[PDB]
Design a protein around this ligand. Sequence first.
Ligand code: Q7W
Ligand code: Q7W
Ligand code: CL
Ligand code: CL
Ligand code: ZN
Ligand code: ZN
Ligand code: ZN
Lengths: 153, 153
Amino acid sequence: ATKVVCVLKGDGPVQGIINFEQKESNGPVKVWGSIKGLTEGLHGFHVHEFGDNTAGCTSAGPHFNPLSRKHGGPKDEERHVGDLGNVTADKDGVADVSIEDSVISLSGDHCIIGRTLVVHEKADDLGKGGNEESTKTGNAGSRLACGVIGIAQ
Amino acid sequence: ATKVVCVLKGDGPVQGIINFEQKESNGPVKVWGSIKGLTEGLHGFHVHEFGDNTAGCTSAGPHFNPLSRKHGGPKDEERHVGDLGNVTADKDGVADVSIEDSVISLSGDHCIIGRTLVVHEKADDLGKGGNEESTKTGNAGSRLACGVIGIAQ
Ligand SMILES: *[Se]c1ccccc1C(=O)NCc1cccc(Cl)c1
Ligand SMILES: *[Se]c1ccccc1C(=O)NCc1cccc(Cl)c1
Ligand SMILES: [Cl-]
Ligand SMILES: [Cl-]
Ligand SMILES: [Zn+2]
Ligand SMILES: [Zn+2]
Ligand SMILES: [Zn+2]
């Protein structure tokens, strides 16, 4: 198994730890952990292209999209590699993350190591929002916290 | 060319931006940038094995050592892949980093993407300290600042 991790931090109260694990080459990736300091509801959750935090979350660039597709949800064929949909915060502002994804990987051309994980201000509309920004960013608004995705023990 | 970047931060006021560039797969890596908030003199400068900063710089583990060698200086054949020697801070506490290295890489099994860069409290003795710890850590002491090494545009 391959293990990777991401510590999410930003300019305000949002902080988290996200773990990724892949048992076999090209098998599904389990994603789990916790984020706190969020507003109750859905928050877009994406792997962005650059592991560049030099100017905070903005230097991470657009969604990680090695296959030049449009934006969608994680259960869509038409999606960016980095499209992990939304995490859900409760009334205590805590999101307990538990995702299994078959498109991201921890090896090869789909590999997310050295990229940035971002948790967003608003819901990702999963490309079903009916403006043109829906098919690019999912309208999830500003970047609340992020981190570079790193190799774990 | 491949470009990667690292933002150094820690428990104190040491902060830095380090850029890495590699023109060809088989080529040297140029390393440049700036670190501020250091004591005047030499600070050990290493790539550590894990890109795991969940509990700060200690979760990065030992020096990145894929070839199971002893600790040395960057000019030594007997070195860890992660052994980049020392940076030098001036009277103003600023290190202007300028390194070229042919052992680290931005591709292959010597790849440093998703690992952690660490600037240390003390001088790395480059394996010439006269104790057993010299051949393992170089006696560079605690971890002042670190970051995960990520893919840049
Ligand atoms: Se998967 C990936 C993505 C970007 C850059 C490098 C890599 C990678 O495969 N690195 C090699 C490696 C060695 C040992 C453990 C791991 Cl998880 C990855
Ligand atoms: Se860094 C590394 C080590 C071993 C095998 C592959 C790689 C690698 O660089 N892979 C991922 C990748 C894809 C596109 C751009 C970059 Cl910088 C890295
Ligand atoms: Cl975005
Ligand atoms: Cl050490
Ligand atoms: Zn995003
Ligand atoms: Zn997307
Ligand atoms: Zn070493």
